[PDB]
Amino acid sequence: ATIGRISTGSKSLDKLLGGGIETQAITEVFGEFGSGKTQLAHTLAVMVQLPPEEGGLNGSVMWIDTENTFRPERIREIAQNRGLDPDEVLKHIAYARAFNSNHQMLLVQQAEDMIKELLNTDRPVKLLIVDSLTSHFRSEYIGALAERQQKLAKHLADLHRLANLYDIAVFVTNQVQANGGHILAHSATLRVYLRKGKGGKRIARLIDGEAVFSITEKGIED
Ligand SMILES: Oc1cc2ccccc2cc1O
């Protein structure tokens, strides 16, 4: 398949990304608590449902939530302010809460079943969100970094296999703050550092110019 792009909702961020986040890729956004990573995830879950003329892929979404941070009412707001029907937008987001890191790993295998079911339809899965990808692994493997890296590596390999095999954009979030971080090392296809700036602006930079955007009723925008 050709590489598809999903607009983030922000012209500035899209330019930094070359048009949007890519299918057949894992995009990792990392930054401190409150930097806006989950807002970007919510926005992408709407944007992907637009037609290509508007920066989407007419796609369905799968969302693995590890922190109980998915907000359907926020999806509704973004959809209503992106000219979509909120009920339809929510009906094309498959949502699961990961209870721990092992269940999170099983959910990726389960996601493949729904991906296959939708593959030849008019609304194939085009976006798989894992938010937060690292939070369970971090809390469960304190003092056991070597084992944590083994399990994370297999998890990321599973996510790569889905992105490439089924032409999906995988979007993952990673909280990194004071003294913290191996990030995801070199595993993602693309690392985006997100931070707060003056006056509530958010600033994004590719790791390995900068885009500037705001969080609004449209999700994010310039
Ligand atoms: O109904 C489902 C929703 C999911 C969401 C995320 C990952 C896997 C899922 C599997 C389902 O059957």
Side-chain angles (χ1 to χ4, degrees), residues 62-64 94-96 107 110-111:
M62 302 191 72
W63 187 307
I64 299 168
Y95 174 72
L107 283 169
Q110 287 178 261

PDB file of all heavy atoms in Angstrom, residues 62-64 94-96 107 110-111, ligand 1:
ATOM      1  N   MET A  62      -9.056   2.149  16.543  1.00  0.00           N
ATOM      2  CA  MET A  62      -9.013   1.300  17.721  1.00  0.00           C
ATOM      3  C   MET A  62      -8.153   2.006  18.753  1.00  0.00           C
ATOM      4  O   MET A  62      -7.112   2.579  18.418  1.00  0.00           O
ATOM      5  CB  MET A  62      -8.492  -0.105  17.397  1.00  0.00           C
ATOM      6  CG  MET A  62      -9.360  -0.792  16.338  1.00  0.00           C
ATOM      7  SD  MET A  62      -9.000  -2.532  16.124  1.00  0.00           S
ATOM      8  CE  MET A  62      -9.687  -3.184  17.633  1.00  0.00           C
ATOM      9  N   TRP A  63      -8.611   1.985  20.003  1.00  0.00           N
ATOM     10  CA  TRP A  63      -8.024   2.785  21.072  1.00  0.00           C
ATOM     11  C   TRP A  63      -7.830   1.897  22.290  1.00  0.00           C
ATOM     12  O   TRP A  63      -8.804   1.354  22.819  1.00  0.00           O
ATOM     13  CB  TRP A  63      -8.982   3.932  21.423  1.00  0.00           C
ATOM     14  CG  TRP A  63      -8.450   4.951  22.388  1.00  0.00           C
ATOM     15  CD1 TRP A  63      -7.904   4.724  23.623  1.00  0.00           C
ATOM     16  CD2 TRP A  63      -8.427   6.368  22.193  1.00  0.00           C
ATOM     17  NE1 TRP A  63      -7.535   5.924  24.205  1.00  0.00           N
ATOM     18  CE2 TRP A  63      -7.850   6.945  23.345  1.00  0.00           C
ATOM     19  CE3 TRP A  63      -8.855   7.210  21.157  1.00  0.00           C
ATOM     20  CZ2 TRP A  63      -7.676   8.320  23.488  1.00  0.00           C
ATOM     21  CZ3 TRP A  63      -8.670   8.572  21.292  1.00  0.00           C
ATOM     22  CH2 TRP A  63      -8.095   9.117  22.453  1.00  0.00           C
ATOM     23  N   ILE A  64      -6.577   1.744  22.724  1.00  0.00           N
ATOM     24  CA  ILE A  64      -6.249   1.051  23.964  1.00  0.00           C
ATOM     25  C   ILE A  64      -5.868   2.093  25.007  1.00  0.00           C
ATOM     26  O   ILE A  64      -4.867   2.798  24.851  1.00  0.00           O
ATOM     27  CB  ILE A  64      -5.117   0.030  23.766  1.00  0.00           C
ATOM     28  CG1 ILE A  64      -5.524  -1.051  22.763  1.00  0.00           C
ATOM     29  CG2 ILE A  64      -4.764  -0.606  25.101  1.00  0.00           C
ATOM     30  CD1 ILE A  64      -4.366  -1.923  22.299  1.00  0.00           C
ATOM     31  N   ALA A  94     -13.339   1.813  18.283  1.00  0.00           N
ATOM     32  CA  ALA A  94     -13.374   0.650  19.156  1.00  0.00           C
ATOM     33  C   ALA A  94     -12.459   0.909  20.349  1.00  0.00           C
ATOM     34  O   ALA A  94     -11.274   1.212  20.179  1.00  0.00           O
ATOM     35  CB  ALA A  94     -12.931  -0.612  18.409  1.00  0.00           C
ATOM     36  N   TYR A  95     -13.007   0.780  21.550  1.00  0.00           N
ATOM     37  CA  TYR A  95     -12.349   1.235  22.764  1.00  0.00           C
ATOM     38  C   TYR A  95     -12.195   0.090  23.756  1.00  0.00           C
ATOM     39  O   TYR A  95     -13.150  -0.646  24.020  1.00  0.00           O
ATOM     40  CB  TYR A  95     -13.175   2.353  23.389  1.00  0.00           C
ATOM     41  CG  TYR A  95     -12.652   2.807  24.719  1.00  0.00           C
ATOM     42  CD1 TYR A  95     -11.479   3.544  24.807  1.00  0.00           C
ATOM     43  CD2 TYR A  95     -13.319   2.491  25.891  1.00  0.00           C
ATOM     44  CE1 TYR A  95     -10.992   3.960  26.026  1.00  0.00           C
ATOM     45  CE2 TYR A  95     -12.838   2.905  27.116  1.00  0.00           C
ATOM     46  CZ  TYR A  95     -11.675   3.643  27.176  1.00  0.00           C
ATOM     47  OH  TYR A  95     -11.185   4.067  28.391  1.00  0.00           O
ATOM     48  N   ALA A  96     -10.998  -0.036  24.326  1.00  0.00           N
ATOM     49  CA  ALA A  96     -10.739  -1.020  25.360  1.00  0.00           C
ATOM     50  C   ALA A  96      -9.804  -0.425  26.403  1.00  0.00           C
ATOM     51  O   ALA A  96      -8.857   0.288  26.066  1.00  0.00           O
ATOM     52  CB  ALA A  96     -10.115  -2.290  24.784  1.00  0.00           C
ATOM     53  N   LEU A 107      -4.553  -7.312  24.197  1.00  0.00           N
ATOM     54  CA  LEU A 107      -5.450  -6.453  23.423  1.00  0.00           C
ATOM     55  C   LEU A 107      -4.910  -6.159  22.027  1.00  0.00           C
ATOM     56  O   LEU A 107      -5.692  -5.994  21.079  1.00  0.00           O
ATOM     57  CB  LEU A 107      -5.704  -5.148  24.179  1.00  0.00           C
ATOM     58  CG  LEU A 107      -6.690  -5.273  25.337  1.00  0.00           C
ATOM     59  CD1 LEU A 107      -6.647  -3.993  26.170  1.00  0.00           C
ATOM     60  CD2 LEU A 107      -8.108  -5.570  24.830  1.00  0.00           C
ATOM     61  N   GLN A 110      -5.927  -9.045  20.038  1.00  0.00           N
ATOM     62  CA  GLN A 110      -7.358  -8.978  19.762  1.00  0.00           C
ATOM     63  C   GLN A 110      -7.661  -7.932  18.705  1.00  0.00           C
ATOM     64  O   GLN A 110      -8.561  -8.121  17.877  1.00  0.00           O
ATOM     65  CB  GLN A 110      -8.132  -8.652  21.036  1.00  0.00           C
ATOM     66  CG  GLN A 110      -8.209  -9.769  22.011  1.00  0.00           C
ATOM     67  CD  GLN A 110      -8.953  -9.358  23.251  1.00  0.00           C
ATOM     68  OE1 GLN A 110      -8.348  -9.022  24.265  1.00  0.00           O
ATOM     69  NE2 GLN A 110     -10.276  -9.369  23.175  1.00  0.00           N
ATOM     70  N   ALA A 111      -6.926  -6.822  18.717  1.00  0.00           N
ATOM     71  CA  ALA A 111      -7.175  -5.775  17.735  1.00  0.00           C
ATOM     72  C   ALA A 111      -7.032  -6.315  16.320  1.00  0.00           C
ATOM     73  O   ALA A 111      -7.768  -5.907  15.413  1.00  0.00           O
ATOM     74  CB  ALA A 111      -6.230  -4.596  17.967  1.00  0.00           C
TER      75      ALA A 111
HETATM   76  O1  LIG B   1     -14.262  -4.535  20.610  1.00  0.00           O
HETATM   77  C1  LIG B   1     -12.910  -4.446  20.723  1.00  0.00           C
HETATM   78  C2  LIG B   1     -12.280  -3.256  20.971  1.00  0.00           C
HETATM   79  C3  LIG B   1     -10.872  -3.183  21.062  1.00  0.00           C
HETATM   80  C4  LIG B   1     -10.189  -1.963  21.278  1.00  0.00           C
HETATM   81  C5  LIG B   1      -8.828  -1.929  21.329  1.00  0.00           C
HETATM   82  C6  LIG B   1      -8.087  -3.088  21.181  1.00  0.00           C
HETATM   83  C7  LIG B   1      -8.707  -4.285  20.977  1.00  0.00           C
HETATM   84  C8  LIG B   1     -10.117  -4.367  20.907  1.00  0.00           C
HETATM   85  C9  LIG B   1     -10.795  -5.582  20.664  1.00  0.00           C
HETATM   86  C10 LIG B   1     -12.159  -5.619  20.567  1.00  0.00           C
HETATM   87  O2  LIG B   1     -12.829  -6.772  20.300  1.00  0.00           O
END
